[PDB]
Ligand SMILES: CC1=C[C@@H](OCC#Cc2ccc(C)cc2)CC(C)(C)[C@@]1(O)/C=C/C(C)=C\C(=O)O
């Protein structure tokens with residue numbers, strides 16, 4: 001969880017990307033993750049819409065178009081590992097901002113109209129550089145949030161681990 | 169993925185003896201199965217090790233038991249789970265350990281998380297048609313309601329899936 005100084009540094013980003021005017025029968029949540037790695041590295045993972053299995057906890061595989069070149073509106077077909085209440089997810093790339101390090105997708109099962117946004121943020125103090133990733137989502141209610149929270153948190157933990165390994 | 173009616177028929181006595189509950193108000197139960205292409209001796213030797221559930225449980229980082237541990241009904245384990253879940257630890261008591269019949273089971277004895285009075289039982293069953301040997305693992309639990317079932321089911325099914333993978337790898 002973020003320190004007071006980090007939360008102060010992220011307030012604008014939160015206000016711009018992770019704050020929703022919720023419609024009835026939908027809830028949202030915001031999660032954060034500190035990563036001991038440079039933002040460029042974290043972003044290069046986070047941005048790869050075609051290969052979410054590189055850091056998502058439950059993805060078995062991800063099929064995408066042949067001759068895939070990544071653009072907003074493009075789709076992916078995620079096959080998930082066995083033991084979960086769905087087997088498959090078709091997902092659409094909503095945002096890809098390489099300048100500002102912002103991405104997001106929408107699902108198109110229980111988590112109906114799930115849409116998330118992910119942002120990458122640089123921090124430096126005393127020559128020590130690290131990253132914070134924020135991820136928020138909107139989802140239709142059936143506490144469905146507990147289940148999405150767990151996936152999101154787990155995905156973000158593995159993001160850290162993979163990024164921290166690549167940074168070594 | 170889910171059992172055949174032939175397997176089902178072979179398992180009814182086990183299900184009646186070990187995986188059937190007279191439920192109280194504010195408690196729910198569920199039964200899960202898993203086909204594993206490996207001998208039952210190997211699967212049992214994994215399932216039976218109360219001190220090392222991390223061998224096959226999806227979300228367990230580590231498990232501490234007492235110094236000079238020998239496995240006896242009544243003994244406890246302290247498990248630490250990986251980050252991102254709605255709890256960080258669980259204290260657990262060994263309820264059953266029958267090596268002859270291949271039955272084990274445990275209770276959670278601590279209570280902070282939503283799964284209050286979680287108690288499960290696990291059985292291991294042999295299968296042999298045309299020199300092809302395989303195993304079926306049944307696991308059932310009872311838990312107090314606040315749908316808890318979806319999360320517990322998810323943990324169970326995942327654990328059983330990794331049990332399959334681990335045992336099938338050890339079968340070589
Ligand atoms: C794991 C998973 C399951 C699908 O939804 C059914 C479910 C569930 C579920 C997840 C966690 C827990 C604890 C309980 C139920 C939807 C799915 C897209 C295939 C998902 O990967 C969920 C992915 C999510 C929430 C975010 C992401 O990928 O960035």
Ligand SMILES: CC1=C[C@@H](OCC#Cc2ccc(C)cc2)CC(C)(C)[C@@]1(O)/C=C/C(C)=C\C(=O)O
Pocket residue numbers: 143146147225227249253254255256257258276281282283286288315316319320323324327
């Ligand atoms: C993985 C795990 C997570 C912890 O809490 C899980 C839960 C829950 C839950 C309940 C209700 C709702 C709505 C959402 C989640 C409890 C825990 C005891 C630490 C556990 O190890 C659960 C382990 C289980 C159920 C079986 C096993 O290991 O054979």
